[PDB]
């Protein structure tokens, strides 16, 4: 997260870190045994880390649970990043409490102008590299589809939306991939892509979760 703020320990209780020996992506806990992340985050050997603040220090509220299975969206295209969504099942159910909590799926899509909270342990610089150890937060509005399409001609599908600031300086970034965009207590987006980070006229692009609610529910119900 570039140009954001320190969230505060366990203030984003649905935020997970995906760990394969090191943090490589964020995700969102949607019930006691399932996480939503980005398909581009796919790999084998995932351990889901819940209740994290400092990802380099055991602080006392963590739950570390290995994934039993990952399910990449059947229509995910890694070239275009269309359908950039994946579900990860935990080998055992997380213990839910105020610091480890699921986030609701949307009942309807959110509109341009809606303020959302985007979070992750990704790069905090728009040029060069600095990875924070504690969770970073950004409040950002959803942008109009017209401004999103104008920023990225030929690249925005119906399964994507832009959020952030066309002036630049405030954005998600590498390492935030797969993490949440939450608006009015609903998971509306997944950190997916963007040209660099926090660049002028290159806002963040997010997977449009409201399009996937049926797939998520039916997948969970049978797996």
Ligand X SMILES: N=C(N)c1ccc(/C=N/OCC(=O)O)cc1
Binding residues for Ca(2+): 52, 54, 57, 62
* Distance separating alpha carbons of residues 176 and 25, to the nearest angstrom: 6
- In the structure encoding, which two tokens stand for residue 62, read together? 């963590």
For position 193 contacting ligand X by CB under 6 A, the verdict is: yes
User: Choosing among Ca ion, ligand X, none, which partner's interface includes residue 179 (Cβ < 5 to 8 Å by kind)?
Assistant: none
Annotated catalytic residue, options 40, 53, 119, 176: 40
Identify which range of 53-61, 90-98, 192-200, 214-222 contacts ligand X by CB under 6 A.
Answer: 192-200
Complex with Ca ion: residue 52 or 171, whichever CB lies closer: 52
Minimum gap (Å) between residue 22 Cβ and ligand X = 11
The helix (run of H) or strand (run of E) holding residue 221 is helix 213-221
Pick 14 or 193: Cβ nearer ligand X: 193
Residue nearest to ligand X (CB): 194
Q: Which is nearer to Ca ion, 82 or 119 (CB)?
A: 119
Contact 111, 142 (CB under 8 A): yes
Asked if 204 is part of the footprint of ligand X (rule: CB under 6 A), the reply reads: yes
Tell me, yes or no, if 23 is annotated catalytic: no
Q: Which of 30, 22, 54, 37 is nearest to 135 (CA)?
A: 54
Single out the residue of 174, 210, 211, 220 in contact with ligand X (rule: CB under 6 A).
Answer: 174
Element (H, E) at 31: strand 23-31
- 31 vs 54 by CB, closer to Ca ion: 54
**Can 40 be counted among the known catalytic residues?**
yes
**3-class DSSP assignment, residue 41:** helix
What is the C-alpha separation between 92 and 197, in angstroms, rounded? Answer: 36
84 is catalytic: yes
CB of 107 to ligand X, least distance (A): 26
10 contacts which partner out of Ca ion, ligand X, none, CB within 5 to 8 A by kind? none
Supply the Cα-derived Rg of the chain in whole angstroms: 16
Q: Which does 103 bind (CB under 5 to 8 A by kind): Ca ion, ligand X, none?
A: none
**197 forms part of the interface with ligand X (CB under 6 A):** yes
C-alpha angle 177-29-76 in degrees, rounded to nearest 5: 50
Please, where are the H alpha helices in 144-184?
A: 145-151
Edge to edge, what strands does the sheet with 204-208 contain?
5-6, 136-141, 115-120, 180-183, 186-193, 204-208, 160-163
Report the interface residues with Ca ion, using CB under 5 A: 52, 54, 59
Q: Which residues bind ligand X (CB under 6 A)?
A: 171-177, 191, 193-194, 197, 204
Catalytic residues: 40, 84, 177
């Amino acid at each position: 997260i570039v140009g954001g703020y320190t969230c505060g320990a366990n203030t984003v209780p649905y935020q997970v870190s995906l760990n394969s020996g090191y943090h490589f992506c964020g995700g969102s806990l949607i019930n006691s045994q399932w996480v939503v992340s980005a398909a581009h985050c796919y790999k084998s050997g995932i351990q889901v880390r819940l209740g994290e603040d400092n990802i380099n220090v055991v602080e006392g509220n963590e739950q570390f649970i290995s994934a039993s299975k990952s399910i990449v969206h059947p229509s995910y295209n890694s070239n275009t990043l269309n359908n950039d969504i994946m579900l990860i099942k935990l080998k055992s159910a997380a213990s839910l409490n105020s610091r480890v909590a699921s986030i609701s799926l949307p009942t309807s899509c959110a509109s341009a102008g809606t303020q959302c909270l985007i979070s992750g342990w990704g790069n905090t610089k728009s040029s060069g590299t600095s990875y924070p150890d504690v969770l970073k937060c950004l409040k950002a509005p959803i942008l109009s589809d017209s401004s999103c399409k104008s920023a990225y001609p030929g690249q925005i599908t119906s399964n994507m939306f832009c959020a952030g600031y066309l002036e630049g300086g405030k954005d998600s970034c590498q390492g935030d991939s797969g993490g949440p965009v939450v608006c009015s207590g609903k998971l509306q987006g997944i950190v997916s892509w963007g040209s660099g980070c926090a660049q002028k006229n290159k806002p963040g692009v997010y997977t449009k979760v409201c399009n996937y609610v049926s797939w998520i529910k039916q997948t969970i119900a049978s797996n």
